Amino acid sequence: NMTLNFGPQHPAAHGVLRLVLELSGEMVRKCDPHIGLLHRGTEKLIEYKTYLQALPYFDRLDYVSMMCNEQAYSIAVEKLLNIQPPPRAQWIRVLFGEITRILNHIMAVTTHALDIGAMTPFFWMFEEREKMFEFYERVSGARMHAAYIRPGGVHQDLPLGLLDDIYEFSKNFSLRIDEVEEMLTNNRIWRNRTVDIGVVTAEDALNYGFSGVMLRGSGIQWDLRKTQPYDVYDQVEFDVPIGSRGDCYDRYLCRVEEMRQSLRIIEQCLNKMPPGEIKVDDAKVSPPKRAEMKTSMESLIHHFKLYTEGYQVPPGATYTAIEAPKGEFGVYLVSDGSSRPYRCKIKAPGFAHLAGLDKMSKGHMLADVVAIIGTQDIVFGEIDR
Amino acid sequence: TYKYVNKKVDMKSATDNAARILMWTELIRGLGMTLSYLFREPATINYPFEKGPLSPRFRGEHALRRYPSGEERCIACKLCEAICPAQAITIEAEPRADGSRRTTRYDIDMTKCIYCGFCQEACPVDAIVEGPNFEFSTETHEELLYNKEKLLNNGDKWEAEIAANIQADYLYR
Amino acid sequence: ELVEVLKRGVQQVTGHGGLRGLLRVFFRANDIRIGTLVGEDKYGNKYYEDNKQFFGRHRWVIYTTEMNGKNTFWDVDGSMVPPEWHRWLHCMTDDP
Amino acid sequence: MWFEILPGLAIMGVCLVIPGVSTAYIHKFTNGGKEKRVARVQYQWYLMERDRRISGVNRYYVSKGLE
């Protein structure tokens, strides 16, 4: 049983993963993934920071999916305060929530192929990604790591003109997804390296807490977005892409299908986004508008206290989970009455998925392990936190 | 509402299958797609000559602004220090002889800074702003640490564009 | 069709002054294209914008030698463009 | 556009024809304007050698009916 460290710096291994492996022949006898090569303290650091200054940590937890993560903390802090965002903000979060799902799937499908050896899909879709980033930048200011979705709504209304461009792009992106399919969906070779690799049973997927496409790929029907609606994902209409004969190829097809379904959700959001405000009107939770803080005393006091001290969330604890592109992203945020949190365990769709690597890659070749790490969309930020 | 992504022997059917298997058709299909793009205009930009577009809210590099008269805007309320997530900004102040309130030392550690843009948000006089420039890569680590004089100098150099950028986005804020 | 494609290539080559002038543009940028000159800033710099080209490349600046006496003809730097014209180049503002 | 991959190819092509034209003219120069005899089998080497003996020392020189 030859032992070998897949290696932190592996061109294939996403980020840095030391996958100590015992390989009988080329077959992988045992898979003991090592983690923490990217532990950084995100959970302890948050205890020493106020709610609004811990929002930027969430973007960094799994930064492929920059915003969708922010929505989970937002929702969580809103629940604890029993405040809910204004109607326009909700649609925004679903608009950028979905755009972000595409961004993650373009990452997951194209990076999967680069490890497999197909390199042209990545360049094709990274150009589309690029175009999306620009939406982020023109809405938040940052290409990624925006900090746009804050605990009481979004930070600033969309620029005057973004919606139109999030249309032109959406109107075309489909063809770009179509092109990739041609090369891979039916490549006489993609199928082989992906089909019947890492099959996970339905009962086993629920047991190991997979909770993501990984469950959906095995045929279990669960989309937290339809089962437990958050924001206004209830008012839209989309089809969960369930899969059968769950294997690397089937789940892939599912991720390409949610890229397709997210364009259906984005279209609607553009078609039906309401006129209104983008942040709660409670100066108590949301910072006052700058014209107001510069002309009204109560607004300055509320601006000064909010930025310097904080929300002062009422004491309680909540576990709120959304459907981040990877899977169920949840924040268990225990909170004392103080302005800074007490605990914030981030449930990472990924801590559970990696664990499954062992029960998925059994009697498999070195190349199979590379394919399976891809079909779990492992971003070491969320796993290591 | 759910959907089945991959739910699913006549001679013709079998023969066509064999045609694909032995003539590698689905492989030739893939080659056609790449040949097609070879003919598309590539999307790259000459980086020094042409620059990727950044709109007014781009956070980029920190600068401290001054009033048109010439009085630096910062009045050392020090809540930019309070809301800095990374502990980057260090401010110590004392009453200037004028009697006014000014910062003796304002040090943004850019390596500590994660460019969140909250400081831009928090300032009441809006003295500290996220300036447009993103190209400030430096040979030595010390250069990245910035004192009041570098930021004020950064502010003077980019004030014209900073003013235009704040002009465009203030209604939104 | 392609003959008009060829005439466009000839005009681009003739566009940059003499044979020596295009050789100079050829070496420092590696791209030959002709555009209206929007402005020349006081630090030596020349800016051109073409509506026909795609969003990424429709605005370009051809840097000039010694803009602060640095021998900048070969070591072109992004920071050389002045702050006033930086936003025009990055498409922050449409107005020149 | 794609116009630009051609420069490089041109320098490949030009460097793949040289060899074929070169080998096929450094032969017709050294052998007196007549293709280098290919002696696959001995008979041919014999005939070739016979030619050498017939004139000068080199086989390419070829005597005719006027000898």
């Binding site: 075309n172 063809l175 | 205009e41 | 069709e1 | -």
Partner: peptide, 28 residues
């Protein structure tokens, strides 16, 4: 763009659909 009407047809024939309608070059 700037397909010239022949590179475009090789593009359309090879792809099997009209890229002209959904181009990679965003325009005004």
């Amino acid at each position: 763009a700037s397909a010239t009407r022949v590179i475009q047809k090789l593009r359309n024939w090879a792809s099997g659909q009209d890229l002209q309608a959904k181009l990679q070059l965003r325009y005004q």
